[PDB]
């Protein structure tokens, strides 16, 4: 588990020097940009259950044999299996935006996930068609103009979508 605050410590320990002033001016922007990050996470987790089924209205409608008899999402515990861990993508992507660095994402969704997904027999590439459909709905909710004072969240929007692209790369 690493951070933005702790990773700029950990490489600074490996070189064994004191922290420079332009690293502290970098972290001062992280504290300054910190409030926005909290707001983004709050909206994702409050619409967390609404994202997953709305991704499941397209993850299964686009590849309709998966549900149909024979596919690996066919029976009912198999169907509840790809809602049990469609949300675990959201459970750890929201941990990554909170920490601000994807080093907590790559131990849980990216570490051994591509190994089980050929051991089980599930289509690995049929996950990353719908994690992209989560990202299309996650940054849409995140960018909402209602109930929040206007501010620039562009850094979060593009590197929020970078966490989904890392979440799709190690499965496909």
């Amino acid at each position: 588990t690493l951070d933005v605050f702790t990773k700029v410590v950990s490489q600074a320990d490996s070189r064994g020097e004191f922290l420079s002033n332009e690293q502290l001016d970098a972290l001062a922007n992280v504290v300054k940009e910190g409030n926005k990050r909290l707001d983004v996470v709050n909206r994702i987790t409050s619409n967390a259950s609404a994202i997953v089924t709305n991704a499941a209205r397209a993850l299964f409608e686009e590849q309709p044999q998966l549900i149909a008899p024979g596919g690996n999402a066919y029976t009912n515990r198999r169907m509840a299996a790809c809602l049990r861990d469609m949300e675990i993508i959201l459970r750890y992507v929201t941990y990554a935006i909170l920490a601000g660095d994807a080093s907590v994402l790559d131990d849980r969704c990216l570490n051994g996930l591509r190994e089980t997904y050929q051991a089980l027999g599930t289509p690995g590439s049929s996950v990353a068609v719908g994690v992209q459909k989560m990202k299309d709905a996650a940054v849409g909710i995140a960018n909402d103009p209602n109930g929040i004072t206007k501010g620039d969240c562009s850094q979060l929007i593009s590197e929020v979508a970078s966490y989904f692209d890392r979440a799709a790369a190690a499965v496909g």
């Binding site: 588990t1 690493l2 951070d3 605050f5 702790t6 700029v8 410590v9 950990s10 600074a12 320990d13 064994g16 020097e17 004191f18 922290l19 420079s20 002033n21 502290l24 972290l27 001062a28 504290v31 910190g34 409030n35 909290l38 996470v41 709050n42 987790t45 967390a48 959201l90 459970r91 750890y92 929201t94 941990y95 909170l98 920490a99 601000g100 907590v104 849980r108």
Partner: protein, 162 residues
């Protein structure tokens, strides 16, 4: 490694649930103080070279035998005094590291983990290093709430020493 943003994650990860408002609140608290913690980092980084040689000659005062007794463990010749400013200079690094992280994590992982094992083998008495850190916490010249913040972590290294 231990950080209030990390501690919100590892608590919510072992439950298998999302980030509630209770993990979210903890993150905000770290951010708010963090404004006064980075004040304490620049106060120690700018006064770094005064504080190291201010400390390694203060420990020679209270322990004058450490410059006299011939032993590798001791700082009799110049090689010990070269390893003097290395070791005490390692402390101000990790103290400044745990300042900007907000937690005791870098202090817990780099400095005090297994410190009782190493000080027994090389016979380095931990009463030496606690005498240098009392000199640092009284002579950093920091003021306000940043003075309070800098001290906790110095005093946290003191209790782990003894």
């Amino acid at each position: 490694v231990k950080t209030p943003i990390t501690e919100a994650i590892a608590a919510a990860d072992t439950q298998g649930r999302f980030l509630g408002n209770t993990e979210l609140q903890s993150a905000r608290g770290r951010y708010e103080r963090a404004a006064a913690s980075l004040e304490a980092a620049r106060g120690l980084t700018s006064n770094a070279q005064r504080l190291i040689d201010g400390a390694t000659q203060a420990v020679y005062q209270k322990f004058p035998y450490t410059t006299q007794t011939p032993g590798p463990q001791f700082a009799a010749d110049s090689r010990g005094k070269s390893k003097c400013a290395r070791d005490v200079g390692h402390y101000l690094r990790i103290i400044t590291y745990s300042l900007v992280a907000g937690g005791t994590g870098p202090l817990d992982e780099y400095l005090i983990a297994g410190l009782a094992e190493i000080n027994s083998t090389f016979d380095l008495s931990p009463s030496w290093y606690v005498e240098a850190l009392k000199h640092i916490k009284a002579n950093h010249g920091l003021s306000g709430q940043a003075a309070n913040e800098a001290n906790t972590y110095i005093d946290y290294a003191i209790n782990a020493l003894s």
